[PDB]
C-alpha cells in the first residue's frame, strides 16, 4: 500500500537526519574563528566586452583562461578574446531562446541550448573556416538549463523535464539518464575528476550524481526555494548552491551536511550565479541586486562587491588560472574583473 | 603585430554584421501567445498564415513573430522572463468553456481557469508595461450554448438575459477587470471573426497603437 511505504519512507529520512546530527561535532564558523580575515577584495573592471544586443544568459571560460563564450536572446553566440576584447567568432543560432553555454575542455567545440529543448553542438576547428553545427541532441522535453562537456564526445545536460542526461555526441543518444529530481533542474557542476556532478533543481534540493552508474549518491536539502546556481569547491570535496532564498550554502560531500550559509539581512533578491576562486577562499555570487558579491568562503563575511551592471548579473565565471572573474548581465555587457 | 592587426579587422567585420542583424531584428514585431489548451490558438495561427514554436508572417509591410510557448509544460516562473520586451501578449480564451470543466479537476470551470492564468499574466512583474491583446474565440458556438444553458453556472452573480450581446459583454468586462495596472497597459479585446480576415487586421491596429502610444512616451509628447 501507499501508506505502508510512506510510513516506511518517512522513517528512512529519520536515520539520514539522525546520523547527520551525530556527525555535527562543531560548526565551520567555530573552527574558522581564528583564521585571519581575507581583507578588502577590491576588484576593478579591466575589460568590458560589448556587442550583444539583448540580455546575456550564459558565459563560459575556456581551459586556456583567455577565450570565452556568451549567448543572449539576440540569437548570437560569440567567442570573445578577453585579452584583446576582439570577437573571434559570432555564431548565429537557429533558436533565439538560449539559456546556457559551454566551451569544451579542448576548445574544439561549443554548445548552447534553451527553450527549444535541444542542445546544439558547434564545431569551431573546421576546414572550411565557418563554425558549423555538428549535432543537435534532442531527447529532452523541457528547456535546457545547463550543459557541461566531459570530453569532446560526452556532454551532460540538465533540463526543465526534471531530468539530467549524459549524451554521446557521435550517436546523438542519451547514454545515461539521471532521474530523481521532483522539480525543474536549473544548473549542474562537474567535479574536477569528471566522475561526479551535482545538480540543483527548483525542488529546493541538490543531488550528487555518478556519471558512470547513473544513480544519485546523496541528496542535500536546507534551502527554502529554487536553487539557481551550483559549483564545486576546487578540491571536489565540497560545493555551493545559490538559491532564491538569497542565501548561498556550502555543502560537503563526505560529511553530507551543510557547512555555511552566506546571508546578509540587506540582501533580499535571488542569487543567479555562483563560482569559486582558484584557492576556494573566495565565493563570488551574482545576485539580482544588479551587483555581485564576493564572500569569504571560510568566515562567511561579505568582503567585497563588484557593482558595475545596470540589470541583473546572469552568469559569473572565473578562469582556471584564477587571474580574472567575468560577469555577464542583462544589460548586454560582459565585464572582466581582476 | 601584422597578425593582430588582421585580427582586429575580423572583430570589426563581426561587429558590422551584429549591428546589421540587430537592426534587422528590431524591425520584427515580437508577440507572445498564451491561453488554455482548447482556446482556439490553433485556429488563430491558421488564419495568420516540441518546445517553443515560432510563426513568421507579414501584414502591411510590418513583420510579426508569434511565439506559441504552449508546449513547454514546465514552471513558467523560470523561463517567462525571457519574453520581457515583447510588443504584445496575444491571449486566447474560448467563450464556449463557461459551462464545461477541465478533464483533470472536479468542478473548477475552464473559464475560471482561464481567469487564473490571466490574473498571473496581466499582473506579472515582467509585463508591467506590456499590452495584452485578448482574443475571445468560438463566439458562434457560445451563442448556441447560451441559448440553451444559463451563464449563472460559471458566474454565481449575474443580472442579465441569456442574450449573446449581454452574455458576452459581461465576460469581456469580467476579463478586463483582472488588471491592476489600469492606466499602464491596454487590453484590446476582439471577438474572433472568420471570413472578414479581420483577426490579423485587429492585431495590426492593436500593435500600432502600442507602438504609437509608446513613441509618444519616449519623446515626452504625452
Amino acid at each position: 500500500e501507499l501508506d505502508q511505504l510512506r510510513q516506511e519512507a518517512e522513517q528512512l529520512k529519520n536515520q539520514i537526519r539522525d546520523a547527520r546530527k551525530a556527525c555535527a561535532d562543531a560548526t565551520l564558523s567555530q573552527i574558522t574563528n581564528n583564521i585571519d580575515p581575507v581583507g578588502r577584495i577590491q576588484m576593478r573592471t579591466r575589460r568590458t566586452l560589448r556587442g550583444h544586443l539583448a540580455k546575456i544568459y550564459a558565459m563560459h571560460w575556456g581551459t586556456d583562461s583567455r577565450l570565452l563564450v556568451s549567448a543572449s536572446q539576440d540569437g548570437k553566440l560569440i567567442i570573445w578574446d578577453s585579452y584583446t576584447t576582439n570577437k573571434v567568432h559570432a555564431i548565429p543560432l537557429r533558436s533565439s531562446w538560449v539559456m546556457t553555454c559551454a566551451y569544451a575542455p579542448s576548445g574544439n567545440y561549443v554548445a548552447c541550448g534553451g527553450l527549444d529543448n535541444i542542445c546544439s553542438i558547434y564545431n569551431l576547428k573546421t576546414r572550411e573556416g565557418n563554425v558549423r553545427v555538428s549535432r543537435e541532441l534532442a531527447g529532452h522535453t523541457g528547456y535546457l538549463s545547463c550543459c557541461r562537456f566531459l570530453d569532446d564526445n560526452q556532454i551532460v545536460t540538465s533540463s526543465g523535464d526534471t531530468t539530467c542526461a549524459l549524451w554521446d555526441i557521435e550517436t546523438g543518444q542519451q547514454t545515461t539518464t539521471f532521474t530523481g529530481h521532483t522539480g525543474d533542474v536549473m544548473s549542474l557542476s562537474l567535479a574536477p575528476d569528471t566522475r561526479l556532478f551535482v545538480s540543483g533543481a527548483c525542488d529546493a534540493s541538490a543531488k550528487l550524481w555518478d556519471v558512470r552508474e547513473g544513480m544519485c549518491r546523496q541528496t542535500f536539502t536546507g534551502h527554502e526555494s529554487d536553487i539557481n546556481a551550483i559549483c564545486f569547491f576546487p578540491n571536489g570535496n565540497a560545493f555551493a548552491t545559490g538559491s532564491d532564498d538569497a542565501t548561498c550554502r556550502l555543502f560537503d560531500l563526505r560529511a553530507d551536511q551543510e557547512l555555511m550559509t552566506y546571508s546578509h539581512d540587506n540582501i533580499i533578491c535571488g542569487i543567479t550565479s555562483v563560482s569559486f576562486s582558484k584557492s576556494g577562499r573566495l565565493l563570488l555570487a551574482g545576485y539580482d541586486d544588479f551587483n555581485c558579491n564576493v564572500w569569504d568562503a571560510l568566515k562567511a563575511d561579505r568582503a567585497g562587491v563588484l557593482a558595475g551592471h545596470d540589470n541583473r548579473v546572469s552568469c559569473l565565471g572565473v578562469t582556471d588560472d584564477g587571474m580574472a572573474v567575468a560577469t555577464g548581465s542583462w544589460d548586454s555587457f560582459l565585464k572582466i574583473w581582476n | 603585430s601584422a597578425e593582430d592587426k588582421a585580427a582586429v579587422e575580423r572583430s570589426k567585420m563581426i561587429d558590422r554584421n551584429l549591428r546589421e542583424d540587430g537592426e534587422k531584428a528590431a524591425r520584427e514585431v515580437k508577440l507572445l501567445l498564451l491561453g488554455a489548451g482548447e482556446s482556439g490558438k490553433s485556429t488563430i495561427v491558421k488564419q495568420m498564415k516540441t518546445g517553443i514554436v515560432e510563426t513568421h508572417f507579414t501584414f502591411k509591410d510590418l513583420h510579426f513573430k508569434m511565439f506559441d510557448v504552449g508546449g513547454q509544460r514546465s514552471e513558467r516562473k523560470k523561463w517567462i522572463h525571457c519574453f520581457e520586451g515583447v510588443t504584445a501578449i496575444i491571449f486566447c480564451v474560448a467563450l464556449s468553456d463557461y459551462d464545461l470543466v477541465l478533464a483533470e479537476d472536479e468542478e473548477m470551470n475552464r473559464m475560471h481557469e482561464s481567469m487564473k492564468l490571466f490574473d498571473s499574466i496581466c499582473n506579472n512583474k515582467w509585463f508591467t508595461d506590456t499590452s495584452i491583446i485578448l482574443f475571445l474565440n468560438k463566439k458562434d458556438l457560445f451563442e448556441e450554448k447560451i441559448k440553451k444553458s444559463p451563464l449563472t453556472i460559471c458566474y454565481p452573480e449575474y443580472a442579465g438575459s441569456n442574450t449573446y450581446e449581454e452574455a458576452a459583454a459581461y465576460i469581456q468586462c469580467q476579463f478586463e477587470d483582472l488588471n491592476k495596472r489600469k492606466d499602464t497597459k491596454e487590453i484590446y479585446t476582439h471577438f474572433t471573426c472568420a471570413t472578414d480576415t479581420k483577426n490579423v487586421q485587429f492585431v495590426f491596429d492593436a500593435v500600432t497603437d502600442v507602438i504609437i502610444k509608446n513613441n509618444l512616451k519616449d519623446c515626452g509628447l504625452f
Partner: single-chain antibody
Amino acid sequence: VQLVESGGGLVQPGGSRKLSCSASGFAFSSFGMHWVRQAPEKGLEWVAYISSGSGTIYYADTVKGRFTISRDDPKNTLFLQMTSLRSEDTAMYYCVRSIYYYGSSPFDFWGQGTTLTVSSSDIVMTQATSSVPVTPGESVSISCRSSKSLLHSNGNTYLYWFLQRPGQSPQLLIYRMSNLASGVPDRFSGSGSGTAFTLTISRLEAEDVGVYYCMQHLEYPLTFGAGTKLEL
C-alpha cells in the same frame, strides 16, 4: 576545399594580363587571400594580400603600383591585374588563403598556381643549408636565422615553416614556433627564440623529401627565405 587559378602562359613584355583564382569548397568571403610567386629556379616571394571584405590591400616592393588585386566574394573568385610585365616577373603564381583570429593557422592551404613566362626596413631570413644529404629513419634538423627579433611583445614568434615536395604546391608544417599544422604528422617540430630557429624531424620517409622554406609574419612584406632541399 581546392583552390585553382587561371591565366599565365606566354606574354610579351609590357603586356597586361589577368590572373583569376576560383575558390571552391570553403567560406571564401571570410578568408584573407595572398599571392606568392616562385621563380623557375629560385625560392618563394610574397607579392600581394587582401584582407576579409577588401578592407586592406598590401603589396611587395617590386610590384607596388604595378599590380592590382581584387576579390569577387559572391562568385568565390580572386583576381590579379598585372600591368607592364618585366622580364623579372617570370614565376609560378600560387594563391594562398589565410584567416587571422586568435589561434588560427594562416597560409594553411595553397593553390596549384599558374605558370607565367614573359618573353624576352625589410626583414631578411637567411638559411645557408641547401641540398643537405639525409637517409630515411635518421633525425635531421634544419636551422633558420632572422635579421630581427621576431618574438613580439605578446610572446608570439611569427615565424612559419613550409614544405614543398617535388612537383607539388607548398604545404604548411608550422604556423608559429612550437606549433604544428593540421594534417601533418607529429614527426615535424620546431623550437627557437628571437633570431635563431630550428626544424627537427625525428624520422622521415620518401614522402617528405623536398625543399623547405622559412617565412616571418612580424611585418609586411612577409619576406621568405632561400630553399633548403633534403637530398635523397
